[PDB]
Amino acid sequence: APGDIEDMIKAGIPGARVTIRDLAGDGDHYAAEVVAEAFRGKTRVQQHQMVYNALKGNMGGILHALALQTSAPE
Ligand SMILES: [Li+]
Ligand code: NI
């Protein structure tokens, strides 16, 4: 449902700030920016792993369907 991706990320990575856009308005492929203190000192691969973990396998095709940008807070 709408908002579920954001909800799952925030539940799984407490303190994260999330900005989700639905590419093409298609309800299928998305792009997300996730900013979290837990990301500081982690590589982008490690940060992305945390986001995949938070989705708990609920989003089929997540490798391509959730394009990610992650960072620690500024
Ligand atoms: Li989309
Ligand atoms: Ni797809």
DSSP letters, 16-50, are -EEEEEEGGG-SS-EEEEEE-GGGTT--HHHHHHH
For ligand 2, a single-atom ion, the residues with CB < 5 A are: 61, 65
Ligand 2 center from residue 61 Cα (angstroms): 6
What would the two tokens of residue 45 be?
Answer: 């691969």
Give Cβ neighbours of residue 29 (< 8 Å, ≥ 6 apart). Answer: 22, 23, 64, 65, 66, 67
Domain that holds residue 50: 1-74
Domain with 50 in it: what CATH number?
Answer: 3.30.300.90
How many domains does the chain divide into?
1
- How were these coordinates obtained? X-ray
Q: How many CB atoms lie within 10 A of CB 51?
A: 23
The closest ligand to the CA of 24 turns out to be 1
Ligand 1 center from residue 7 Cα (angstroms): 17
Ligand 1 center from residue 37 Cα (angstroms): 27
